[PDB]
Amino acid sequence: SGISLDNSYKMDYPEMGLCIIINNKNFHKSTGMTSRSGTDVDAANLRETFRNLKYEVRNKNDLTREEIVELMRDVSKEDHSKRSSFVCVLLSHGEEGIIFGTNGPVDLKKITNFFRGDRCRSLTGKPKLFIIQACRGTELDCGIEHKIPVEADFLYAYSTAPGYYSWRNSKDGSWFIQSLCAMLKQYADKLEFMHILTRVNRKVATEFESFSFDATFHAKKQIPCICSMLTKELYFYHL
């Protein structure tokens, strides 16, 4: 056999894997959280985009904090042996390190811990991708001009920089998900995933600026934040 390199995750398992989309639009009145108009546009865009990448997409709408934890626990207990990867997309309100169920918050770390290298063994060594459209704070950008770590092989694709709001358009969907889907559509058969996400960064950074009757929220910008603990390059295609 000729010389072999292992710089890329193996993505030719029988299945690409699950794509779990949690789409939280309407929140319990007692929480005081507003409806997330436009998030259904995001969820439909994501479903179609990951469908064409051959993911098994499961869309879940309006989950409580208890339903989110139970879903993630159940999913992490499936046999992923024949699956190349795992993707989870979270569309909700949030703060730094937190995403909101319809009735209250969930620590991101509690969700992701179910998939740790030591706790979901059929995903050990495989890329686990968390894509998070949610606020990470209330800052606004004014613009200008054993053998492997249990935390290895995670990628957090955050819509926004730490501490900042994330922007969502009630008609077109969120800036980040719009751009992510467009760039996966155009480049998934061409670019390594970090290079795709860098094009997403540039699209959000250059093409979007907020328009508000409220001067506090008008003319603001956004930069997403790629947080990679991956150990290999990730191509959605193979052969």
Binding site: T34, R36, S37, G38, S92, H93, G94, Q133, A134, C135, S159, Y165, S166, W167, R168, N169, S170, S174, S210, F211, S212, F217
Partner: peptide
């Protein structure tokens, strides 16, 4: 435009 709205914030999340």
């Amino acid at each position: 435009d709205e914030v999340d």
